[PDB]
Design a protein around this ligand. Sequence first.
Ligand code: ATP
Ligand code: ATP
Ligand code: ATP
Ligand code: ATP
Ligand code: ATP
Ligand code: ATP
Ligand code: MN
Ligand code: MN
Ligand code: MN
Ligand code: MN
Ligand code: MN
Ligand code: MN
Lengths: 415, 415, 97
Amino acid sequence: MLRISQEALTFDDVLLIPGYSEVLPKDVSLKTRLTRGIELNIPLVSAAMDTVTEARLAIAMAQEGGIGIIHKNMGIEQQAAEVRKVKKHETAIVRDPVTVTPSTKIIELLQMAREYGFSGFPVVEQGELVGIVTGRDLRVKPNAGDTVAAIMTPKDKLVTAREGTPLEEMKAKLYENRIEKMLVVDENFYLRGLVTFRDIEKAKTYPLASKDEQGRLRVGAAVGTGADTGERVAALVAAGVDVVVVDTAHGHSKGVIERVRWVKQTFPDVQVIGGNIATAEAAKALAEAGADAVKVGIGPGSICTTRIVAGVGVPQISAIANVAAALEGTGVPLIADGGIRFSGDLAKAMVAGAYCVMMGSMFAGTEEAPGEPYKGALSAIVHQLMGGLRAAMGYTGSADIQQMRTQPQFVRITG
Amino acid sequence: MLRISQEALTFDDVLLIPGYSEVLPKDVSLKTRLTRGIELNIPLVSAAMDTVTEARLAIAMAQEGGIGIIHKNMGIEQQAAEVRKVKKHETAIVRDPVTVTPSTKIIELLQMAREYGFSGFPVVEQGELVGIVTGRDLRVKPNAGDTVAAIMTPKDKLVTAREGTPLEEMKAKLYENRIEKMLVVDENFYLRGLVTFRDIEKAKTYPLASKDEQGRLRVGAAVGTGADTGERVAALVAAGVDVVVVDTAHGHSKGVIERVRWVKQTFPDVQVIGGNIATAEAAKALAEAGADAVKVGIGPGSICTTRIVAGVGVPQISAIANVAAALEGTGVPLIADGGIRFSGDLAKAMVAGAYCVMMGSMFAGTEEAPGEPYKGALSAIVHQLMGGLRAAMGYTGSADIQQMRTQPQFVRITG
Amino acid sequence: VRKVKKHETAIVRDPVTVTPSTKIIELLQMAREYGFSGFPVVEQGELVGIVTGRDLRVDTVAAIMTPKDKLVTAREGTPLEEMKAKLYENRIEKMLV
Ligand SMILES: Nc1ncnc2c1ncn2[C@@H]1O[C@H](COP(=O)(O)OP(=O)(O)OP(=O)(O)O)[C@@H](O)[C@H]1O
Ligand SMILES: Nc1ncnc2c1ncn2[C@@H]1O[C@H](COP(=O)(O)OP(=O)(O)OP(=O)(O)O)[C@@H](O)[C@H]1O
Ligand SMILES: Nc1ncnc2c1ncn2[C@@H]1O[C@H](COP(=O)(O)OP(=O)(O)OP(=O)(O)O)[C@@H](O)[C@H]1O
Ligand SMILES: Nc1ncnc2c1ncn2[C@@H]1O[C@H](COP(=O)(O)OP(=O)(O)OP(=O)(O)O)[C@@H](O)[C@H]1O
Ligand SMILES: Nc1ncnc2c1ncn2[C@@H]1O[C@H](COP(=O)(O)OP(=O)(O)OP(=O)(O)O)[C@@H](O)[C@H]1O
Ligand SMILES: Nc1ncnc2c1ncn2[C@@H]1O[C@H](COP(=O)(O)OP(=O)(O)OP(=O)(O)O)[C@@H](O)[C@H]1O
Ligand SMILES: [Mn+2]
Ligand SMILES: [Mn+2]
Ligand SMILES: [Mn+2]
Ligand SMILES: [Mn+2]
Ligand SMILES: [Mn+2]
Ligand SMILES: [Mn+2]
């Protein structure tokens, strides 16, 4: 008459059993679903933390084939402006470069300059492009009580490209005119972007980039429950957010359920994820409320505060599986959120039933993450992660993710 | 509806239960099979790693009663030349000693000399033996613009032995002529070997030495899958290799199966091992393909990258047993490859069902291993290993290996 | 010693040169050892152009060099402040004396 439901397993309790395999790791397909209406080419999502996902990494994740969820620890208008950044981003275009103006004194220019760590500035007048100044233009004082009009390259010169021009054509003109900056303009010669030679010499055609119907990069955003949530969700949906995540510690509650329903009935053109949960019953509740995806993870970390401060949690491998089984015929995907420290874990989560996995601290050290163990680019981490998934998929003989989630088997281990 | 096949046990989960015992450790028989057509006097095989098995250790292992598998991390002709070394090796004979020539200047001799760390050189002419020079010959310049012809011991002198002469007769003549070098010659007086007094004063009659039908030391070699494999296997079989090991991370695959079959149908006079595997189904696949032995081991190490980077593996004790059971009536042996850190483990593997065990890092520090914790001679390690096996065999009352593999029992333990 | 004695402070006497002719693969290869890019292009004494870093971001130097009918030269001893003046107005870094 002690009330134990079951024995629950985490990642370190199980291993994947190798199977007959005809497809090589490099040839398996990693494409999956984030929500019933959103598809990722890789099963990766970055977590909604101020140390992890803002616009900068959100972009990176979208380009890599996954998605980022902007964190809410910031003003409403700030969070929506991050969503704007990601939704409006083109590869290497600064679409809002720092500018100057014919009448800005050269004293101000040197000052700016210094403050920013670069020297190239388009000269504008109420949006109209009228000239450009750079480092070369500044190598002599004509003698300084004078302005950018005096040293800038005048309008009649100026190499320009229209907005939406391929980088190649764009690269070609920079070299042929032996210059380093390309000014993007529109049909009225208003300045729409800056594109540098240095920025073109990097970063691909991301053929996996997760894009919306309009060819813009996908992004999500977190929201809590209570009072500003409705106002918050509204600004985020106005910003063009693809998916709204109702992100909480206890997803199996009146307040979370009600809010997921409220979102899905008020903003019918967004996708809604509901979370965190860890049981079958919780899963069915969010599905009924109309959740487009369900997020799985309560006390999934052995030292995490949920376990230790509250004595609450469910080992992730059994949580995921219990939720997977619950959502069977629904078409509602599940995301595995927490407790993954190695790429082996990511494979295990997938075979347990996840459609893709959310990660926090993996990405937290990265070059893209906010501010300032600095792990360098997100490229290497994401590549290693998928590297291991593919290896796992090779061993088990799973050609794609549907198969990986449904067919391989585990051995239970001890120590 | 979480998909667990079973609970799997590793070495630290079990212990051997002592039984009625009439034969002492020193009196049990350790002879076993490596492949259906190759017999070892001890159940030891050294692993195919650039840090472990090249010709030098391959020899040592053969002489000790086991076998070595030359690694593939080298050019095709290089790997085959290692196989040649082992297959052509006689105890203490340098069969390709460094030589000189009547006309090599004494400047060159002193130089060589230094470079090599020894001073004794047979003097030859297109294979014909014509004289010898050593340290004593070099203790005065007659005055150096002159050659080895001038200081060497002439042909008419020269103690020689024909090739294939016992070391005793050979030792006897060295002492009686009070000299340190024996020159081996053939029926035309062509130089076939050098045999030193220092080299005779060491190393036995290895009565356990694993030899082929022609009395040459046995050796194996690893090969992968893909493109040069066919060419590689061909040069290795031309080199006289006893056994070809198709050594891969995932043995239960189209590519490995197909290649094992290809080898066994193209080179019918070699033995073929197929690997790594960890399930019963995998075992049956390689047996069907015609494997002469099967190698067992996937993620057998608690920290190993397979487990951690890919989340894949099967604890070795259950892998071995599951494979043993599968190969029952076939006559196809199984080799246990990975996860052994103490000699107790080696006994456990044997009782679990292995015919012999492959080891890597055990031998990796050794004097024979490639280059440069230096563990000294392979003798001591191999002796300690078998020491513990014999003790285990004493406790369980197993007079030989067939019995050890089939009769004793385990207790399951906890911590 | 000659190396020092041939140093002005900066007019550089005896500069490293190249030819249209010399392969583009080899340029790039200099380039990298010498330090510095930028080489007055010469045939057999006569100045026929100039090749700097900007010309290289793209078989002979003939295709990518900056040609004679476009070179900014200054005759010797033009003072240095006059020479800087001209360098500024052409928005270039190297003056050929
Ligand atoms: N006005 C600006 N506003 C926003 N971003 C800028 C601006 N100017 C430069 N950047 C960013 O900084 C990068 C480097 O600027 P910088 O002026 O150093 O380029 P550059 O003159 O081409 O340098 P280099 O001569 O080494 O190629 C650009 O590629 C761009 O990403
Ligand atoms: N798109 C453009 N059209 C016309 N002129 C330009 C353009 N971009 C830059 N310039 C002009 O070309 C000259 C060189 O500018 P650029 O920015 O390429 O080099 P820089 O970064 O100033 O030089 P450096 O790399 O040596 O510091 C300057 O006079 C600048 O005003
Ligand atoms: N020409 C050679 N080619 C290959 N190996 C050699 C050659 N000469 C010597 N060795 C190896 O080096 C060992 C020692 O050579 P060294 O010349 O020191 O012998 P040594 O003169 O008999 O020494 P000591 O006088 O101490 O007995 C030999 O036993 C042999 O294994
Ligand atoms: N097989 C042989 N037949 C005839 N003479 C030999 C033979 N081997 C060596 N000698 C000669 O015997 C002499 C002594 O040679 P040996 O190699 O035994 O001693 P060493 O190593 O030169 O002397 P030490 O050990 O003091 O350095 C030399 O003149 C050498 O040329
Ligand atoms: N072809 C050459 N032969 C000999 N000396 C040279 C040559 N080119 C440059 N130098 C000298 O070595 C230095 C190399 O600098 P570099 O050629 O990079 O100048 P730069 O391109 O004008 O530099 P920056 O772009 O940073 O202003 C120059 O200051 C010059 O004194
Ligand atoms: N004396 C000159 N006359 C005519 N053109 C020149 C002269 N010197 C350089 N150029 C040309 O001007 C352009 C840039 O040359 P410059 O040496 O000023 O740039 P750079 O050394 O490549 O500077 P960075 O690498 O810092 O951009 C090239 O097209 C080059 O051929
Ligand atoms: Mn610049
Ligand atoms: Mn530059
Ligand atoms: Mn000696
Ligand atoms: Mn001696
Ligand atoms: Mn320069
Ligand atoms: Mn410059």
